[PDB]
Amino acid sequence: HMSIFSPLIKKAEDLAFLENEEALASLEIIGRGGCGEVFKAELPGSNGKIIAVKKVIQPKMRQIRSEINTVGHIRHRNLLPLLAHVSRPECHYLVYEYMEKGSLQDILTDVQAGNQELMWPARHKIALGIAAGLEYLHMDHNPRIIHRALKPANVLLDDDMEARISDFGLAKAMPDAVTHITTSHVAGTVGYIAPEFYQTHKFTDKCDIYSFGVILGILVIGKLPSDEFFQHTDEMSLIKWMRNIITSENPSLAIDPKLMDQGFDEQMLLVLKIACYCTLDDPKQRPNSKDVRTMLSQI
Numbered sequence: 001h002m003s004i005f006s007p008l009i010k011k012a013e014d015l016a017f018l019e020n021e022e023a024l025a026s027l028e029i030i031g032r033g034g035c036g037e038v039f040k041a042e043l044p045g046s047n048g049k050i051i052a053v054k055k056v057i058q059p060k061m062r063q064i065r066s067e068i069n070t071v072g073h074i075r076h077r078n079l080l081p082l083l084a085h086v087s088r089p090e091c092h093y094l095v096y097e098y099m100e101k102g103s104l105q106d107i108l109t110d111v112q113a114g115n116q117e118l119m120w121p122a123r124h125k126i127a128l129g130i131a132a133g134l135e136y137l138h139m140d141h142n143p144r145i146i147h148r149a150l151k152p153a154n155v156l157l158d159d160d161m162e163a164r165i166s167d168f169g170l171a172k173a174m175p176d177a178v179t180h181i182t183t184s185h186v187a188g189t190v191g192y193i194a195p196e197f198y199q200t201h202k203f204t205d206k207c208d209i210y211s212f213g214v215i216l217g218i219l220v221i222g223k224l225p226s227d228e229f230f231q232h233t234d235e236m237s238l239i240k241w242m243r244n245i246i247t248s249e250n251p252s253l254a255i256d257p258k259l260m261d262q263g264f265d266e267q268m269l270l271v272l273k274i275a276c277y278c279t280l281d282d283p284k285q286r287p288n289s290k291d292v293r294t295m296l297s298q299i
Ligand SMILES: Nc1ncnc2c1ncn2[C@@H]1O[C@H](COP(=O)(O)OP(=O)(O)NP(=O)(O)O)[C@@H](O)[C@H]1O
Pocket: 030, 031, 032, 033, 034, 036, 037, 038, 052, 054, 096, 097, 098, 099, 100, 102, 103, 105, 106, 149, 151, 153, 154, 156, 166, 167
């Protein structure tokens, strides 16, 4: 079973090498995710167009095709357009356009090593991008879509440096909450799981607001939630450590020293505050995607 949502010319030219299991073994691996896997491949029919193939493993439910077909027909400037969905018997393949710039996670880890640099105006453009893509999913699409796995690795940068959200969360395809929490630890991505999910086992729109709030803090602090710096600190979490520095009398301490003297301190401090409201322990106290965008665009 195969469905296409984007002008890739022949349905057979893309199909042939994905059905061949031995064909993936020689493809380059761009994104390591354990169970989930992403490959790098050149589309044969196109004139040298590189694509990214996400491999998700399902653990007679056709609801996967129903939701993915909805995901495939979503078009937004800040959402990575799904190109094709291949459904094997016990596996699924998602086809995206390969972005040379990588993901937000890839860049931020490269900024730590100094192999890359990202200035605040770009981070501000990324935040506004994710905010625009979130509001469309939460309050503009005809069925309300919830991205249940929002993280900097699922925010890709195009050649215009606009954030694009990918690897959407599919309620039918996702594993049980207890396992999902377990692999979230090994992947170092627990920090994006809202506190309520531990008692609800259901992803809400406020869970997307929580994951977004962490990303806003990362863009200013420059450290990831899995950073061992936070495992030596007093609060033992990026969200709580950021919250106390906000209310401290020296809030600039949380700012990455790489964007200090650029004159964006006042702007970055306002982003930290919006990250606090998006990451409050009570989801009812958190803003929605519409108000989050308005606060980010007010600077
Ligand atoms: N269209 C794409 N273009 C370029 N790189 C991509 C693309 N999609 C994914 N990647 C890379 O894949 C990496 C993440 O791989 P992935 O298996 O999706 O783990 P994850 O995103 O952290 N969790 P999840 O996607 O929710 O299962 C990203 O950092 C990218 O480098």
